[PDB]
Structures are given as structure tokens and as C-alpha cells.
Amino acid sequence: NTGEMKINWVSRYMPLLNKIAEEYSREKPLSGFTVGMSIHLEAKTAYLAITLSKLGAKVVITGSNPLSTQDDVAEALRSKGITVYARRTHDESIYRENLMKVLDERPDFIIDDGGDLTVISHTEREEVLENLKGVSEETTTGVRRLKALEETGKLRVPVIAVNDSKMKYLFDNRYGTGQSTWDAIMRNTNLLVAGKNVVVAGYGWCGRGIALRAAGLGARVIVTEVDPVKAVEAIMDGFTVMPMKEAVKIADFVITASGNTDVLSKEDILSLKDGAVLANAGHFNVEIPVRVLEEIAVEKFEARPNVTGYTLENGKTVFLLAEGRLVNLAAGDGHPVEIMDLSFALQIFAVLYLLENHRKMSPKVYMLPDEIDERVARMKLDSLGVKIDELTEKQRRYLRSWQ
Amino acid sequence: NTGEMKINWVSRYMPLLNKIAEEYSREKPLSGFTVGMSIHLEAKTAYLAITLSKLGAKVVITGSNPLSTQDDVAEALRSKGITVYARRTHDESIYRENLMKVLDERPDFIIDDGGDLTVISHTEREEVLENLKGVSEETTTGVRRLKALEETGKLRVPVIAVNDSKMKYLFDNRYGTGQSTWDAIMRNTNLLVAGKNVVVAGYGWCGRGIALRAAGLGARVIVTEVDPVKAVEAIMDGFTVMPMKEAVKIADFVITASGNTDVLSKEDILSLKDGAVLANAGHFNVEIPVRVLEEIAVEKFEARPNVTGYTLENGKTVFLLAEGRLVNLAAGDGHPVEIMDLSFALQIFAVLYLLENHRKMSPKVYMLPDEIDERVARMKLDSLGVKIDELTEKQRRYLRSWQ
Amino acid sequence: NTGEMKINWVSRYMPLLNKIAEEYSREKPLSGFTVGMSIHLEAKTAYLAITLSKLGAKVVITGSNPLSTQDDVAEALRSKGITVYARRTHDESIYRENLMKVLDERPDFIIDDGGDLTVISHTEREEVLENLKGVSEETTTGVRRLKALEETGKLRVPVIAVNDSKMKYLTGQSTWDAIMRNTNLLVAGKNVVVAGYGWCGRGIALRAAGLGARVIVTEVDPVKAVEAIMDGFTVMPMKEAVKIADFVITASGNTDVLSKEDILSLKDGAVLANAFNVEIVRVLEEIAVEKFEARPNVTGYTLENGKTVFLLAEGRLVNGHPVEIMDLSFALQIFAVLYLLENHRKMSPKVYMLPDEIDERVARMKLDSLGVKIDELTEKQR
Amino acid sequence: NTGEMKINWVSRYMPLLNKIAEEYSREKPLSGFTVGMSIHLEAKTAYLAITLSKLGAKVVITGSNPLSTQDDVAEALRSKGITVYARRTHDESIYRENLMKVLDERPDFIIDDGGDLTVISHTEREEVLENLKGVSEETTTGVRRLKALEETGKLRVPVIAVNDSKMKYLTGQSTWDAIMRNTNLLVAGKNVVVAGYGWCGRGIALRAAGLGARVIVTEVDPVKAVEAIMDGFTVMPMKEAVKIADFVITASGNTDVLSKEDILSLKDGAVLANAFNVEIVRVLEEIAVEKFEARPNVTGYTLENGKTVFLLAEGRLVNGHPVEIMDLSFALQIFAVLYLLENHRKMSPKVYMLPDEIDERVARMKLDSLGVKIDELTEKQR
Ligand SMILES: NC(=O)C1=CN([C@@H]2O[C@H](COP(=O)(O)OP(=O)(O)OC[C@H]3O[C@@H](n4cnc5c(N)ncnc54)[C@H](O)[C@@H]3O)[C@@H](O)[C@H]2O)C=CC1
Numbered sequence A, B: 001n002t003g004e005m006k007i008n009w010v011s012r013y014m015p016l017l018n019k020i021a022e023e024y025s026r027e028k029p030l031s032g033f034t035v036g037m038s039i040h041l042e043a044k045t046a047y048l049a050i051t052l053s054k055l056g057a058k059v060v061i062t063g064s065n066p067l068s069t070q071d072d073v074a075e076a077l078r079s080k081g082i083t084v085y086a087r088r089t090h091d092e093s094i095y096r097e098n099l100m101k102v103l104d105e106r107p108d109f110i111i112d113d114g115g116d117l118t119v120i121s122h123t124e125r126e127e128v129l130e131n132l133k134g135v136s137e138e139t140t141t142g143v144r145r146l147k148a149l150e151e152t153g154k155l156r157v158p159v160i161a162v163n164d165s166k167m168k169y170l171f172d173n174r175y176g177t178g179q180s181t182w183d184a185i186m187r188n189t190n191l192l193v194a195g196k197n198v199v200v201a202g203y204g205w206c207g208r209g210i211a212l213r214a215a216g217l218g219a220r221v222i223v224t225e226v227d228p229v230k231a232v233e234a235i236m237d238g239f240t241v242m243p244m245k246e247a248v249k250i251a252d253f254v255i256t257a258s259g260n261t262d263v264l265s266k267e268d269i270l271s272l273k274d275g276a277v278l279a280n281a282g283h284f285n286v287e288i289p290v291r292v293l294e295e296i297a298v299e300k301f302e303a304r305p306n307v308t309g310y311t312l313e314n315g316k317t318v319f320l321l322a323e324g325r326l327v328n329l330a331a332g333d334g335h336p337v338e339i340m341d342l343s344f345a346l347q348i349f350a351v352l353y354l355l356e357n358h359r360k361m362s363p364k365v366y367m368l369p370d371e372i373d374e375r376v377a378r379m380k381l382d383s384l385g386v387k388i389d390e391l392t393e394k395q396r397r398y399l400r401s402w403q
Numbered sequence C, D: 001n002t003g004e005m006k007i008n009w010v011s012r013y014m015p016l017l018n019k020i021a022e023e024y025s026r027e028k029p030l031s032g033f034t035v036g037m038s039i040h041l042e043a044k045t046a047y048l049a050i051t052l053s054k055l056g057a058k059v060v061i062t063g064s065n066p067l068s069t070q071d072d073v074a075e076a077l078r079s080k081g082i083t084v085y086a087r088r089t090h091d092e093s094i095y096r097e098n099l100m101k102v103l104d105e106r107p108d109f110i111i112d113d114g115g116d117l118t119v120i121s122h123t124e125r126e127e128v129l130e131n132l133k134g135v136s137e138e139t140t141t142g143v144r145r146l147k148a149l150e151e152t153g154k155l156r157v158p159v160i161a162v163n164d165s166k167m168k169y170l171t172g173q174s175t176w177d178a179i180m181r182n183t184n185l186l187v188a189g190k191n192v193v194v195a196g197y198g199w200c201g202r203g204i205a206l207r208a209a210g211l212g213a214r215v216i217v218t219e220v221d222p223v224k225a226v227e228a229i230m231d232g233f234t235v236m237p238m239k240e241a242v243k244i245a246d247f248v249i250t251a252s253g254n255t256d257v258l259s260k261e262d263i264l265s266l267k268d269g270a271v272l273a274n275a276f277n278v279e280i281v282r283v284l285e286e287i288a289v290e291k292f293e294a295r296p297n298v299t300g301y302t303l304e305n306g307k308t309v310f311l312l313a314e315g316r317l318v319n320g321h322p323v324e325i326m327d328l329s330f331a332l333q334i335f336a337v338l339y340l341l342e343n344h345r346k347m348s349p350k351v352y353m354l355p356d357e358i359d360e361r362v363a364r365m366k367l368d369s370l371g372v373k374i375d376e377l378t379e380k381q382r
């Protein structure tokens, strides 16, 4: 069926996950443990779930899928004994309920998205903390929220921040996040990017990728920031940096990539050109203040699929993509297959590290242990047939000396 | 005179150092302190010394200049009251003696190159430790040697590793180290790089820059490594990775960029093609084993300026550039002026941080304090006239929350 | 109305057509003239039709349109007094009948597609030549056909090749964007084989290297092979290159760039693409024990050796434009029709290149709409 | 011997000339023939002379050589029986006398520089035409002059334009490499102004953007200005661009691309470069209160406003080759002389393009020396 075909495609090109299954599927180290997951459901993340199941885990998943798609992939997962709640998750109260359903299964380990399950676990479903042994979190927003639980002394389980990885810097995110973001914008609008002014708010991993891709498509790029180091980076990449209040005066597209709230103010929005297009690439739908748009608009209308027009008190109309939600995951090509294979390998090993070591770990956010980065790098090399050098004893002693 | 003209050129394009002088030259925070320095002497580093002097420091310098050049720059520094010992430093025992001369001045702060002054201070000139308040070290080799003093419990003063900087990743070192390395190789050999096999040993900051520039010049690049993460990086940049023993069989150029010893063995050297060219971009002259070359060669001859031919037992001749010493600093264009301005600003602030805080600091190697990176980034933005955004209170509270 | 909302969206982002309406909709230079059109019917082309109408033209359109998806746009054009013959055009004989219906209206000017209206006008409906004053042709196939018509001595009206324009660039980048979209696979750290090192192959190879691929080039011309080596690529025979290829891209314009032995040497999961319907397919179809659709635009062929290989886009060129790009194209086409209006009596029955003055006028209008100012040459200059 | 060591170095890295010696030094096709040459005398060109000699030629050379730095190479050639007239060639009349001395030897074939030997042969030393059988010309100025000689009807011997070769590419990259070398300044994070957006300007602009510069383009042609915008650059008038420029690069092939008012608007420390002796200089010389040499290849001009601006390479094209590149060039030139040897009786007194067979032979030899194998077309192909 179509769901099995989507999974079969990705399985061909996930050599690390396939090697992990080869290495551990007989031993079944996760037998008798439940792994709860919050993911965007699609064939790649389905393969992560499948690999966890091959390792013996009971896997229970909620999908953030406001797109109303990948049902075929959900049905394929059900046929393999994996529990998936992803339908109707455009409605936030349904996504929330589906998280509650994952927590009803009393997971031993959580692979979280944006920290959603873990935060609920510490705020409203504290009975799950008895059984919860560890959390793996991959996103910046997630790490931020979990670090805040830590700093306020509310965190109760060890968390591994997998976005630590030495291998984030490995790939250029212009062909991951940048490419998938511009593909989505181009599909929703059919507008030219070349020769346009594109404003990117935030110049971290996500924003830089979006900015570089926009420049590759021939746009004039303007970057906004609050961190002076990041602003200097953007300048040294050839971009213009200025405050948002000035940038909005000339923007054709404004893309938020900050992980922050209210990156446009009311006054910024009233400065936009007639026909400006706004989109969000951050985790939550508050970067572009949709509630402010809805409050100040004289008229609201659906201009085309996935595009909301807001006509302002000043007579101008601005357009919001995807209700200000994350724009680039709907089509299921957020990142290349082999990049997700790498990321998922790191997450599987993070879960196995927590299985082995959680009793020894404090309720703190840890950086990804270096041994995991090295393990996965070595497995990648082996899968490519690449051999490297080994230090001699003379060399080891040289490197530990002050000669 | 020519020395003043060289300094006048760089002073025009060092806005951070000029701003630092504007900010601090009246207050003279370094009045009554001696700063000892080991540098490659040229107009840029001369300007660092000049700026320290404007801040009140007595500045005493040794130049690693086996090149036998920049005398005019040394004479210009002398005319401004700065003490410079750089002549005849091709002879290692003279470079050593010049280090001893710097330590005779009992420096309060050291700006070191490769840790040379600091290591001598801990091993042979321990009387200088009474007055020594802090060390700033910029190179990887330096940090390694000082960390080894720390790990063995021999370090006695605080050290700031300025190569920590958030801003190392700012510039692409293919147009710093990579460009200056290939310029030197091209000048010494007059050989084509395009369509050649180039082997780079080590894929850190230095090696990656060298590899990318070689690829930009049209060479087929092969990378050797001992760190699996770095090897995966090289593969993801489009290069071939294999063990040195295989790479040497096809190499036209072998460039060492490891910070290690004996990156070629005798057996590797006997595998090289007739006419292979070898060069070192690492700090010390032991990466390419010159003593092994000298020991196993049937004949040795100067083939052209800066190029030594070694004819081996196998009948083949290989060529070594610059006696296996660092190849790219002789021409004084190692890095662009404005990049050195940034680096030197970080080093000046590191010295001022040590002045203010050394009594509170342990005898350990510290990462560059984050406040210094941010200070210098802000100064860079201000010098370019760039303004950025400031977080609102709502935003600050959002970022400290788990919502 | 959904048709009207589609047209309203594109009208917001078609500044050249909007400025053309502003400049000419009171003069109405095309009042009393009929413009016949064959075009793919959708909101953008609808806006070209609307703009011609604002200029006074009676517009009569055939839509080559094998799906009903743009029938709401058709219906919106009909409500504006534009005549649209588009429904049921998935059948070949109905497309032709709709072309006949356009010609029944005795157009003064034709905006053609593949030269279909013009060729019928010269062969089967010669009475239309009485009133036909000029033809604008933007399609490559169309300009080819009308040029061939000229060379037989049978062309009877002036034609403007709008695609022969200094702004013709409506690459390696396009090819890899398409490959990545259709496969969702990583290019970095892969072995990419490019067959052929002319302008196209070289661009594909350079872009692949910039994406982090290790690139191998195959060639038959030693001069081109040396060029590939000097660009930093490995050159070797295809028989060797296929043993390590993750992607094989034929850019060579030869037949049978892969033999049966080459295909049986491919790695399991290799991806094949053309960037002719003969470079790589008949060979694949002949040797494959199973053919299946793996993904949209990706066909799997499982071979006698148990391995499976993947062909992109059934072997067609793997490398349909944004609103503002169509705006630019449509402005050149409107001005070409106006040039024919003004000048057809002085023009020969031949295919003319787009007059350079039209390129410069549209470029200037584009700059004006962007708020851009440029320099002007001084007397001494020039 | 230092001359001999220089020649020994280059002989190690000239595999095409070494293979040519291997193939022809026993046949000695040039025995009984004199080859006259005007060339810049250094170890690489010495090796061309040596190789011609191994093929049997009596070689007689003039060195256009305004310094004595390569007199050791000259002396080494003299020890091998090659006749060298190079000393004191910093004086113009001595260079000419040395050319006269080459022609005194009644060359059968000339390898010319700027066409100097050939033009003298046709104007003042017509007796040489009795024995002169062919001319090889690799220089652009030379091919221009000999082509002009043909068009007057006064050319009397066959000439091969070796530079009209499919391997002619002996860019934006060259320009910025030169700028960086001569200034040691950062390009990233700077405002770069590029005047002109033809092939050259576009390459300079694209490379600058890839180095991290913010690029501004100035133009007078609206079509080119739109192209620059669609590439992601800012377009504005030069009068505005100069107010923020860190670098201004004229790539436009116009006169006076900068006025006096433009120059007085430059930032203190702006860097100017041409990539004609008239784009930017006379204006600078006229307005400057002080001129000084700031660095090698960099002139400072201090203006009436107190600011100083910097001109690279006195306004000459800011954008002399590796050993293996000269090897390739010399192989084409040797084969051109051999082609003239074999075929001059069948050739007209005109300038011929390099025969394509010579391109293909040298490319094949280059591939062979690298150990590279390529494909070959099948019958069906094709
Ligand atoms: N759409 C996707 O596929 C992805 C989404 N994300 C999400 O995107 C967001 C950013 O992620 P990362 O780039 O990894 O974060 P990051 O922390 O590396 O970068 C965010 C940047 O935004 C800046 N910033 C914060 N507030 C700002 C403001 N008011 N104006 C301008 N700049 C501001 C920060 O200084 C920082 O440099 C997070 O919400 C993350 O979860 C991240 C990666 C992929």
C-alpha cells in the first residue's frame, strides 16, 4: 500500500538505523520499556519508531500533523504494532489530548518535540515521573524549555540535548531547513523570490539556512538579530543587518526563525508593504503574532490554500502562510533521508545511554555525550567503506606533552 | 620609511584596535605592567604591540622570523620604544635565546605563540612565575601544551585560550590560512595545483581551509584523519578520506595540518611518487619528519629557493618546502588585516580581563569569556554603523519560561 | 468565487500588466481587433487575456487543458466577456475543434502555442489569412515550426519570435533542485557521475561539487576530459564509474550512454536521471524483472541480479513559473502584439526576432516598478 | 650551475615536452631547419628551446628581457649549442637589433612574439621570406597584427594562431585573488561596487558575493540591470553607490566610469581597480593633492577633502603561468611548427586557426601522462 511504499523508500537510504537494527535487534535492549514520542509523522520518523520496536520497545506516538496527512503511514505503523495518534491534530486541543494519551502509557523514555511531553509531565501529569527514566530532545525550543524547568528547580529526570551534536555543523542547513522552507513558500504563493527583499528574523542554525537559500534563489537578504555575534556572522555572509522596524518597511517576505515570541509588533505590522508575505519557521506559532493580526485586522479572508489575508486599518493587506505555524514540514521533505538517519541514530543511542546510565545521572539537561557523536561517525564511515588512521603511541604521548 | 609605511597601511584597516586606543589610551590601564609577546613579526602584529603600548604597557617581543625579513618593521617599533628581538631567528637556538630575553624582563602578562614562553617559564625559568599574572594563547598547539601543563599539575598561572572564540567559525579559513598556504606553495614551486592530487593531513580549522582552497584551485583533494567526526565532515565537503599509507601512493602534494608529530612515517615516505612536494602548515617542524628525511636520504640538495630535494634509497626524489617549517607566514599575508584586527581585539580584552581578574582565577586554561566575544562583536557592529534589536521584557520572560 | 479569487491573487503580483493597463486602457489600441490565443489556461494566462481586453481586444482563447482543475478560471473569464473554449480538451480532436473555433472568429492577431493556430491558418483555414495581421510566438516548438514554414516559402504573415529576446533566461542549480525534490536524498558525501562535459554537464558537475558530492565525469572528447580534470573532477570510463555511482546524470546528448553491462554493475539503490528520450530506458525495460513506481517521479527497476535502480521522471529532462516571471513574459508578448498592430504593413511574411526596443522598454518598466534607478551614458561616453 | 638547476626543476614537471622528445628525438624532423624565436627568456621557455633542439632544430632566440635575472638560464642554453641574443634588452633599439640577428640566421620557422619577427621579415628584411616556411603565433597582439597583415594582401607565409585552440582557457576568481594579494584586505562584510554587468562584471559580482561581500552593481543597460537584480544584487546609480563603497571595480569597458564628484564622495580608504587605460586615473592625477606608493601595486591619492583613496596596479587590468600550463602551451606550439613543416607547401599565406587535430593530440597525451582513460563512441553512437 502507499504507506508501506513510503516507508520502503526511506528504509533503503537509512543505513545507520539499519545497522543499529542489525546490531541490537536480537538482544532487544528495550524489551519491557515503553518509548513515548512526539514527532511530525512521516515516513522518516516512522522508521525511527520501527527501529525502536525492532530493539524491543513498545512505541507510542503522537503526531503534530495539522496538515491532515500521512494517514497511510500511520496505518502502516499500526499494522506493525506501533500505537499512533495523529488525526485531527490541526486542532491544538486534540494534539494536547494525544500527548495526554502518550503519557497515559507511562513511558520509560521520551523522545520529545519541542519539550511538549516533558513539560506536560512536569506540570500536569506528575504521576508519570515515577516511571520516566530519561528524555531525548532534539530542538532548540525543547532544550530551552527543559533548561528553564532545570533553572527553576522543577526538572525531575535527566534530559539529553541531542542538538549539542558535533555533527549539527556537518551539513549545511540551506539544503535542509532552507530548501524545504522556500519550497513551501513557493508552493503556497507561486511568487518569485529572485529580486525580492527577504527578511529573516534570527540567524541561528535555522535562520542562516533560510537566509542562504533565499540568497541562492536571488533574493536580497536582510537579517534581524538580538545577538551581536550572530549579527556579525550575517554581515560576514554578505547580508544586511538592521532592526526589524526598518526591515519591515521594505520586506517582500518576512520569515521568523527565532524561537521567541512577538518578533513582529503591531507597529512593525502596520509598516509592512501592501502584499507582504509572512511565514514562521520556528517551533511555536507565536513568533508572528497571529492574535495581534486577528485583533487589528479590518477584514480576514482565505486568499488561497494555506494563505490568510489580513486587511489592516491602514488599507493594506498582508498575507500569512499556514496560520503562522511552522511552514516546511507538511510536505515531508524537511531534511534529506540520510541526514535524518544520522539524527535518529544519535537519538537512539541517546535513549540507550539513558537506559544504561539514568540511575547515575542528575535531573539536569546534559549535552550529547561525545562518545555518541564518535560512535555514530564511526558507523557512518564503516557504512561508506572508509578507513582512517589510528594514533601511534608516540603520537598519543606527544599530544599529552608540553613539547 | 618602508617600515612606517607597512604599519600605516594596516592601521587604516584596524578599526577595533583603533577604537580600543580611543577608549583606553588616556586611562592607560596597562601603565606599570610589562607584556611579553612571541609573534611572527610583521606590520599587523606590530600594530597589536603599538596598541598595547598606547594602553601604557611596556612591550617586549620575540619574533619567530626564520625568513630573515621585516627588519624595517622591527626598526619602526624600536623608534616607538617597543623592544623587539627578531633577527637571525632561523636559528632555533637564537629564537630560544630571544625568548629567554623576553623572560628576563619579568613580564606581568604573556601573549604567547604556541605556548613557547609559558612552557619555558614553567620548565626552565620558574623565577618569572612570581611576577607572571596571566597568559593569552591563540593557537591550538599552544592550548594543547598548556592544557598538558594543567593536567600534570604543573601550571601556575591562569591561561585564556582565545581560540575558543565564537568568532573562529565567523570567517572561512580557505581565504586565510588556505589562500596564504597555496600562495606560498605556488611561489616556492611554480607548479600547477589544478588537476593534481592534494593530500591534507588533519581536517580542523587549518586543514579544512587548506583543503577547500585546493579544491577551489581545481585539485582532487584527499583528507587524512584520526577523528571519525572530522573524517565525516571531509566526506560531506566532497573530499576523499583514506589512510595516509594509501594517500601517499598517489599524492602530488602532501600538506600536514595536524598539530601532531610524525604524520608521515619512513614507510609512507618511501611510497611517495618521484617529485612529490611536501609542506607543513602546523606550528612545529615535526609533522613532516625532517630528521627521518635527513637520515634515509642518499642525497640532499637545494632544488630552488625554499625547496629541499631528498633522493631516497628507492631512486626517487621528493621535495620539502621551507625545511618543514610552517609555510604561509613568510610573506606576511597569513590572514586579512580586518580578521587580525578582530583576533587582536579579543587578545587585548583577554589581557585586560586577566589584569582585572587574575587574583580570582585558578591556574587553569580557561575558554575565552563569552562577554569578550560579545564586546568585540558589538564594537564591530558599531564600527560598521549597524544597529540590531533588543529583547523586550516580555521576550526575556518568555525565554526563561517553559511555555 | 474561487476562479475570481485565483485571478485576484495573481493580479496583485503582476505589476507590468497592471502598468500596461494603466498606460493603454483609455487609448484602447486594440479596439476593433480580435486576438486569438492558444495557451495553457490558468489564473496567470487569464490575466494576460484580461489585460488584452482592457486594451480593447475581443479575446478568444483555446485552453490546452487535459484536467478540469482550472474550469473555475475559465468560467470567471467568460463572465468578463472573454470567449473561452477549454472544456473537455483531454481529447485530441476536441483541442483541434477548439482551435477551429478560435479561427472561426477571424482573428487579427494570434498568440500561438506550438504554432498550431498559425499552421492550421496556412493549410486548412486559408480564409483566416484575409484578416490575420500578425502572430506572436513564445514557444520553442512554435518558432521552429513557423521558421520551417518560412523556409518552404509558404508563410504569409509576419511572426515575432518573442523567445528571441535578450531576457530569454526566464541550470546545474535547477537540475539538483529537481533531483533533491523528487528523491529527498542527500547529495553531500555521495558519488555523482556526470556523463558529458559540455555546458550542461559542467554546470551539473560544478553544482554537485558545491553540494558536497565527489564528482566523476565521463567523456568521449579528450579536450573536454582535460577540462573536467582541471576543474578538480575524476575522469574514468563509464564502465568503471557505474561501480561506485550513487547518482548517474546523463548530460551528453548521445544515445545509449548506459549499456546493459553498465546497468548490471550499478549499486543497489543508484539513482539515474537525464539532464532525447534515448540517453539512459528501452534497455532498462528490456532487462528488468520488475518495474514499480517507488515515489512520485521515481520508477524502480529490479534487475536479474536482485538489485533495484531508480529512474527519475521516466528519463525525461529532470530540469511552470512564478507569477512575476509570467508577468515579464506577458509584457513582452503584449508589446509584440502592439508592435505588429503598429507595423505589420511594413513587415515581411517572415519570423522576426523580438525587436530590441521591446526588451529595453519592458526592462525599464520593471526597474521603474521596483523603484530602481540606473546610470545614463554621458556625451563623451557615447 | 644555477641556470642549469632552474632548467632541471622545470624539466621534472614538463611531461608533454618530455614525451615529445621521447617520440621524435631519434627521427629529428627538424634536422636541417632553423627555428627563430622571440620569447620571454626563463627556465620554462628555455625548455621549449631545448626540446626543439632535441628534435634537430638549430634554435636562435631573442629574449625580450628588461632585467638580467635570467642571464644564468641564457648562459645554460648557450652551453647546449642554442644561440641566445638576450643581454641588455632593456633598451628598445637592442631588442630590435637582436631580432635582426635572429633574422640574419634565415629561419625556416618562426615562433614569434607580438608578430615582431614576422612583420620585420615582411617590411625591412624581405630576403628572409625566401627561406621562411611558416610562423606560429601564440600572442593575442601577434595574431591581431598578422591578421591585419593578411587583410592588406601583404602576408607571404602561412601562420598558425596557436591561441585559437579549444584549450584556450590556459575570472571573477582571478580578479579577487589579485585584489586580496595586493591589499591583504577582507572582502567578507564589505560593500563592493561593480560597474558593468556583462560577462566580466557578472563574474566579479558573483565571486564577491561568494566571498561574503554585499554587492552593488551599476549599469547603463536596463536589461543588464534587471539581470543583476534577479541575481540578488542591489542596483543604483554610481553617484549613490560610491558613498558606501569599500571597493569599486570597473568591469564595464567605458571611459570615465568615475567622475570627479564621484571620487570626492568615496569613503576614506576606498579601493579602486579595473578588471582600457581610461575606465577610472587622469582625473585622479588632476584632483589629488598627494600621490604616494602605499604598498606594492597600490597607489594612494589624497584628495582636497582630506580623504585618501587607493588605486590598484595603476589602473591596469588587475586580473606568468605554472610549469604544467606552459608545458601544455609549448606542446601545442611544437606541434604547430611540425604541422607547418609537414604541410606548408599546401597552405595559403594566411592566418589559420590551430588545427583541431593538434588540440586533440595534446589533450590525449595529457590524459595519457595522468594515467586517465576515457570512453570511446560505439558504432551505433556515431
Ligand atoms: N522549521 C524547521 O525545520 C526547524 C525549526 N527549528 C526551530 O526554529 C527556532 C530557532 O532554532 P535554531 O536556529 O536552532 O535556534 P538558535 O537559538 O540557534 O537561533 C535562534 C536565533 O534567534 C535569535 N533571536 C532571538 N530572539 C530574536 C528576536 N526577537 N529577533 C531576532 N533574532 C532573535 C537568537 O539570538 C538566535 O541567534 C526554534 O524554535 C527551533 O525549535 C529549528 C530547526 C529546524
Ligand SMILES: NC(=O)C1=CN([C@@H]2O[C@H](COP(=O)(O)OP(=O)(O)OC[C@H]3O[C@@H](n4cnc5c(N)ncnc54)[C@H](O)[C@@H]3O)[C@@H](O)[C@H]2O)C=CC1
Pocket (backbone or CB within 6 Å): A389, A391, A395, B139, B140, B141, B142, B177, B201, B202, B203, B204, B205, B206, B207, B224, B225, B226, B227, B230, B257, B258, B259, B260, B263, B281, B282, B283, B284, B326, B327, B328, B334
Ligand atoms: N599555518 C597557519 O597559519 C596556522 C597554523 N595552525 C596550527 O596548525 C595545527 C592544527 O591547527 P588547528 O586546525 O586549529 O587544529 P585542530 O585541532 O582543530 O585540528 C587538527 C586536526 O588534526 C587531526 N589529526 C591529529 N593527528 C593526526 C594524524 N596523525 N593524522 C591526521 N589527522 C590528524 C585531529 O584529529 C584534528 O582534527 C596546529 O599546529 C596549529 O597551531 C593553526 C591555524 C593557522
Ligand SMILES: [Cl-]
Pocket (backbone or CB within 6 Å): A195, A196, A197, A220, D229, D233, D234
Ligand atoms: Cl532587490
Ligand SMILES: [Cl-]
Pocket (backbone or CB within 6 Å): A174, A212, A213, A215, A216, A217
Ligand atoms: Cl543555494
Ligand SMILES: [Cl-]
Pocket (backbone or CB within 6 Å): B195, B196, B197, B220, C229, C233, C234
Ligand atoms: Cl586528478
Ligand SMILES: [Cl-]
Pocket (backbone or CB within 6 Å): B174, B212, B213, B215, B216, B217
Ligand atoms: Cl576557493
